[PDB]
């Protein structure tokens, strides 16, 4: 296997060195006339390529016959074809390019004197040594990090960044076309009597400059529009991902922190992306142009320059991780400061009522001190990285100058070509310095975007929404041995073995002391949390099997401290309905909940914009608005979580009528968590949830007869 392959390779090398070296030039000199030495070289190259390719194909066929040994030998043999192609076509291609470059200054010595170079052992060795590394690189490329995640944002915008690149290339070509058509300045400006040369050159230069300026204008417009789209899309995606998480993700991550990550980290990421990507593409194109000019100058020195760039990019690869960690810490400290500010500015009555503005200021100052200690390191690293880049490029230039001096002394390179190459290599090194300065910025951008990409890639720890949207839902809820422990403290059980049922047309009061778990029951029945044990069925099927919006318009809850958003009362009452309700429905809901009386009396009525914290609405009015919001949905399950604590006499009468008198009571089941015994006394069922377990249940008369916990609670004030 391997031995046969190596023997075949050795035989191929020997045959190429012996026969193809000498026989082919003679044959193609006899067949072809002397008037076309380039044709002779091309024919010899094609013949050598064909012979080597046939030999490689034969070797591959022979090796495929046996499969007992390893596949590494086949992998190495896979590069025989490209190596043979390079060997065959290196010389004829160079000869063709040199002939096409100029028809009056031939480099000669390759196209002519064809056999004098094909049979030349020195030229044979040179061709082999040139073909080996090119073939190795081609084979290595063909056989084929957080930065990839960072750059994946520019996926759908390739068709526009390509236009940007095309316009940049056109601008570069227009810039370079000035010296190639007008020459050096002194060639025409200094000449006295210039009438057909000064005006011509001046107009041509002005036209080219104007064209380049307009091309740059169009490219910049395209690029900025694309970057704006990228920024908007990324911010929207991050916000959606944050909102797709679970209910406890927002108890571990605080409001100000999440807000800073969503609004500020993305903005900085996008700004860095735009600036550095424009810079990188422009300098890449101009560096490629400079490399073309340098290759025209001296190919050997250009290759020497290209060999040493990884040496310059070594250190940035080492310090990128330090940059990333530094920026991660900076973003985290900024988020903590944002949390402090948000928490303080949202409870100003409480801060002032305890004279604690100084303490909030001190907390903010501590976070800012952390950020300052990080910024010191940022600045020192900036200075040191600048030093390193400058020294690196200076050493590159110095080494190239020394090698060029050695070559000019040795006669390998002419002085004029050397000077041209040096003058353009200085610009190339400046562009390399710009790219080196870009690299730390990309590392810092990775550090900044770490947390938002963690948000985007995070997997919510909650079941996905189902697909059930039955036309008619009865509203029959069943807790079957339901047990629950909060994810942050799973060792403690808040609910243990809750078993009960809510039937439409009936009211089930849930009474007990504080911390018993009643609001936890309400949260479980709203699908905010999944029970750890047992099962919770709505209409005989688990809540996760129902669609999100269908479930949350079929089960409506008035919370213990209802949240009201900063919008008109009309928009608060109908908050989350796909079809905006008519004002008749809104006023009907407000009448049912008793919120019509005070809403109508407002100067603007239902258009009264509410404060962010709902401070305009007094206690009791906010609960009435929340009840109207719950009732406008016409839900099948209605949870009232201490909803009568703040309601006045009129709203209390309204809720009593809604529960036990309204004709709609037959179409829904009510879970009435409360402590007002007036409503509990009429409740069809009563459950005394004490310590997370239902100590007793039944109607009011039964519990009073039992003289258990319920009787003790009722007669406690009478003691």
């Amino acid at each position: 296997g391997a031995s046969l392959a190596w023997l075949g390779t050795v035989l191929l090398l020997l045959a190429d060195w012996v026969l193809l070296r000498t026989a082919l030039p003679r044959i193609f000199s006899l067949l072809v006339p002397t008037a076309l030495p380039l044709l002779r070289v091309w024919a010899v190259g094609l013949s050598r390529w064909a012979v080597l390719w046939l030999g490689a194909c034969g070797v591959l066929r022979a090796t495929v016959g046996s499969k007992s040994e390893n596949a590494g030998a086949q992998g190495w043999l896979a590069a025989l074809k490209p190596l043979a192609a390079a060997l065959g076509l290196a010389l004829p291609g160079l000869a063709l390019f040199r002939e096409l470059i100029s028809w009056g200054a031939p480099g000669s010595a390759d196209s002519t004197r064809l056999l004098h170079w094909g049979s030349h052992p020195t030229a044979f060795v040179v061709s082999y040594a040139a073909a080996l590394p090119a073939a190795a690189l081609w084979h290595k490329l063909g056989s084929l990090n957080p930065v990839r995640r960072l750059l994946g944002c520019l996926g759908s915008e390739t068709r526009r960044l390509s236009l940007f690149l095309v316009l940049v290339v056109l601008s570069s070509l227009g810039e370079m076309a000035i010296p190639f058509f007008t020459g050096r300045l002194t060639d025409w400006i200094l000449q006295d009597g210039s009438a057909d040369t000064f005006t011509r050159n001046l107009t041509l230069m002005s036209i080219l400059t104007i064209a380049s300026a307009v091309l740059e204008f169009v490219g910049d417009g395209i690029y900025n529009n694309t970057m704006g789209h990228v920024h908007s899309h990324l911010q929207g995606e991050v916000f959606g991902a944050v909102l797709r998480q679970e209910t406890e993700f927002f108890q571990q991550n605080q409001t100000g922190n999440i807000m800073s990550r969503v609004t500020e980290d993305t903005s900085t990421l996008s700004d860095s992306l735009s600036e550095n990507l424009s810079l990188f593409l422009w300098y890449l194109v101009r560096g490629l142009c400079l490399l073309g000019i340098m290759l025209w100058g001296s190919v050997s020195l250009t290759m020497v320059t290209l060999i040493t760039l990884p040496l310059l990019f070594l250190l940035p690869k080492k310090v990128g991780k330090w940059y990333q960690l530094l920026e991660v810490q900076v973003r985290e400290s900024l988020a903590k400061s944002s949390q402090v500010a948000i928490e303080a500015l949202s409870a100003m009555p409480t801060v002032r009522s305890f004279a604690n503005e100084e303490g909030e200021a001190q907390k903010f100052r501590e976070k800012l001190q952390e950020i300052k200690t990080l910024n010191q390191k940022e600045a020192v690293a900036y200075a040191v990285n600048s030093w390193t880049t400058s020294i690196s490029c200076m050493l590159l230039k110095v080494g190239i100058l020394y090698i060029g001096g050695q070559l000019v002394t040795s006669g390998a390179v002419s002085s004029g070509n050397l000077v041209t190459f040096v003058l353009y290599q200085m610009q190339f090194t400046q562009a390399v310095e710009v790219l080196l300065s870009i690299y730390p910025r990309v590392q810092k951008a990775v550090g900044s975007s770490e947390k938002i990409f963690e948000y985007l890639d995070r997997t919510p720890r909650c079941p996905p929404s189902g697909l059930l949207t039955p036309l008619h839902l009865e509203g029959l809820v069943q807790f079957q041995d339901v047990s629950f422990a909060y994810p942050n403290r799973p060792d403690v059980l808040v609910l243990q073995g809750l078993t009960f049922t809510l039937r439409p047309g009936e009211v089930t009061a849930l009474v007990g002391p504080n911390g018993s778990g009643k609001s936890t029951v309400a949260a479980l029945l709203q699908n905010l949390y999944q029970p750890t044990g047992g099962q919770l069925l709505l209409d005989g099927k688990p809540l996760p099997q129902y669609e999100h919006r269908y479930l949350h318009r079929q089960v409506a809850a008035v919370g213990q401290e209802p949240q009201v958003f900063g919008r008109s009362l009309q928009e608060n009452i109908a908050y989350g309905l796909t079809q905006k309700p008519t004002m008749e429905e809104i006023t009907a809901a407000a009448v049912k909940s008793g919120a019509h009386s005070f809403i109508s009396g407002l100067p603007q009525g239902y258009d009264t914009e509410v404060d962010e914290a709902g401070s305009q609405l007094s206690g009791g009015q906010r609960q009435a608005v929340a009840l109207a919001r719950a009732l406008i949905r016409k839900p099948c399950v209605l949870i009232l979580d201490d909803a009568t604590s703040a309601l006045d006499a009129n709203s209390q009468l309204q809720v009593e009528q809604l529960l036990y008198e309204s004709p709609e009571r037959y179409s829904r089941s009510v879970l009435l968590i409360t402590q007002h015994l007036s409503l509990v006394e009429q409740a069809d069922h009563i459950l005394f949830l004490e310590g997370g377990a239902i100590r007793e249940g039944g109607t009011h008369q039964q519990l009073m007869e039992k003289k258990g916990c319920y009787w003790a609670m009722v007669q406690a004030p009478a003691d």
Binding site: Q251, Q254, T255, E343, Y486, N488, R489, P513, N514, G515, S519, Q560, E561, G619, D642, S645, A646
Partner: protein
């Protein structure tokens, strides 16, 4: 209920006291008010 927490009086309450029951929040507010030995005490729905 303080001693039943994970770390007693060093337990994090959460943003806006979210990791707490309503009555526990009211009792904590009452304790905060009383720790100062105020001359004037204003109980605004302190037992709702």
């Amino acid at each position: 209920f303080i001693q039943e927490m994970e770390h007693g009086i060093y337990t994090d309450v959460g943003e806006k006291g979210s990791q707490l029951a309503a009555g526990q929040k009211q009792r904590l507010a009452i304790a905060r008010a009383l720790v100062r030995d105020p001359r004037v005490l204003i109980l605004d729905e302190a037992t709702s």
